Each structure stands twice: as C-alpha cells, then as structure tokens.
Structure 1
C-alpha cells in the first residue's frame, strides 16, 4: 500500500517539477504520470500553456498548509536524480489537479509506477470533454 509522507516546499520550478525538503534533504521532485507544457523545455524553452501550468502548480503548493509526497511501488528517483511521486497539497493531488484543468496530459506510463493511472486518465477524459485549456 502507498503512504503519504510530509515534505516542505522549497521552490516550485515548473508545472511538472517542484523542489522540496524531504527528510531533511533538499530534493527536486518530478510529478508522476503527467506531461505538462514546459517553460524550461530543453529543445523548445517555453511552450503554449507552459506559463499557465507553471503558475497553477506554484499557486497550489505555495498556498498549501501541508504538502505530502506519495511514492509509487517502483523506483523512487529517475535518471536525473529527481524523486518520482504524487504530490498532495492539503489532501488534493497536484498531479490530478493539473490533468483535470487541462493543463497536463497523462504521460506514457511505466509499470510498476502506475498506481493512479486510471484515476488520472478519467480526469483527462473529463477535461477533454469540457475542452479545457490544452483541449480548447
């Protein structure tokens, strides 16, 4: 079973990345299962909706009373050393919130790090149905 652990916000970096203090160590976390338009894309730089997704994540984590990270059942860090997790702001999953607002698409999922995949695909279907942002 997955479990939530407390973390402290250091700084929001992009729509899909946030720097947190986890167990006394500064770490960069990459939001699991979502692809957000970027402002720091290696090849493109700032993409359409990138500023929006970036501001949404920033607002959500900065205004939260409690931030929690939830690792999946597979590897906990990617090749760049970023923690791979589901981030919660006052009980609300940031990963899902972005998808629900049409500010992120469900990424190519890598089992076993796919626990909340169906949940996110459902939110994406709704955002698309409502033609929100990315889907407008």
Structure 2
C-alpha cells in the first residue's frame, strides 16, 4: 500500500471526514472501523477525537487498500493518516471504535487494528468500559 496526499475540508464524525483528494472534494469512510453515530454513546467523543486528530495535522494522507476504493454511497474507503499516525488505528486503540466491516480484499491492516482493539479492551477504555 502507499500513502497519497490529501487536505482536510471538514471533520464529519468519528469515522467519516471530508478531504480534498486529487483536487476533488470527497467524503472518506475509514476502513475497518465503526464509530458510534453522534447520537449514540461515545459518538460525540469519537467525533471529537477524529476532529482533533485531522484538524491538528500538518499532513493528511490517504492510503487505499487493494480492493474497492469507493463504497456504494460514493464514499472513499481508506486508511487516513494525520502526521504519520493512522486515525483508524488510533480510534480503535482508544476504545472509540470497534474493528468492523472487514471485507475480503480491503483488510491489509486488519491484524494491526485487532491488536489495538485487544489492548483497548484490556484497559477497559470507553466502549469497552
């Protein structure tokens, strides 16, 4: 896999963000995770967490996996990095997302994220509390 540039347009929620990619506005849905909706328990904390991570970043990068790059809603499917740190993994590590939506072919970082989830669960963080 490889990282490509993007710039923030707007934070949306825990697991979606609007980025300019190849000079076009796109909504990205983070691979391999599920954050609670804003109206759900931990939804606001997830949203805030992703917001801070992407807004404070000097450098946003997107990393597509080997499979489909857009979902059925037209959302980009990617790993998103903020100054080198993967948002997807950071959410899981903090107990603010569950590993989820692991589809064959877009699962390169699955075991990395599962490892993070195990550690969040051990620590009884957030969702796992």
- TM-score band, normalised by the shorter chain? over 0.9
Instruction: Give the Cα separation in 2 of the matches to 1:135 and 1:90.
Output: 27
- 1:120 and 2:113 correspond: yes
State the TM-score, normalizing by the size of structure 2.
Answer: 0.98
- Secondary structure of the structure 2 residue equivalent to 1:54: helix
- Secondary structure of the structure 2 residue equivalent to 1:84: strand
Summarize the alignment of residues 14-53 of structure 1 with structure 2, pairs less than 5 Å apart.
14-38=13-37, 47-53=40-46
Instruction: Give the Cα separation in 1 of the matches to 2:101 and 2:23.
Output: 31
Instruction: Give the Cα separation in 2 of the matches to 1:108 and 1:82.
Output: 14
Q: Which residue pairs with 1:93 in the alignment?
A: 86
Instruction: Give the Cα separation in 2 of the matches to 1:114 and 1:3.
Output: 14
Q: Which residue pairs with 1:7 in the alignment?
A: 6
Instruction: Give the Cα separation in 2 of the matches to 1:65 and 1:95.
Output: 17
Instruction: Give the Cα separation in 1 of the matches to 2:29 and 2:101.
Output: 14
Instruction: Give the Cα separation in 1 of the matches to 2:68 and 2:123.
Output: 34
CA displacement, residues 12-42 of structure 1 (integer Å, 9 cap, x when unaligned): 101000000000100000000000011xxxx
Kindly report the root-mean-square deviation, in angstroms, between the aligned alpha carbons of the 2 structures: 0.4
CA contact (8 A) 2:5 2:21 kept: yes
Give the ranges of 4+ consecutive aligned residues of structure 1 lying more than 2 Å apart after TM superposition: none
Instruction: Give the Cα separation in 2 of the matches to 1:107 and 1:69.
Output: 19
CA displacement, residues 108-130 of structure 1 (integer Å, 9 cap, x when unaligned): 31010000000000000000000
CA contact (8 A) 2:6 2:20 kept: yes
CA displacement, residues 68-102 of structure 1 (integer Å, 9 cap, x when unaligned): 00000001000000000000000000000000000
Instruction: Give the Cα separation in 1 of the matches to 2:80 and 2:101.
Output: 18
State the TM-score, normalizing by the size of structure 1.
Answer: 0.93
